[PDB]
């Protein structure tokens, strides 16, 4: 029961956080790319 509830929990968090730092690794990319305030601003 717990266990099942926790599973799918994870599951919920695995593709937002797929997403968010996927977001933020390109950010960190571009930052690393070229250097502009607005890519540290981002």
Known sequence: ????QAKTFL???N???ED???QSSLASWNYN???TEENVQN
Request: hydrophobic residues 40%; charged residues 30%.
């Open 15 to 17: 593709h937002e956080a």
């Open 33 to 35: 790319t070229n250097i």
């Open 11 to 13: 599951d919920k968090f």
């Open 20 to 22: 968010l730092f996927y």
């Open 1 to 4: 029961t717990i266990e099942e």
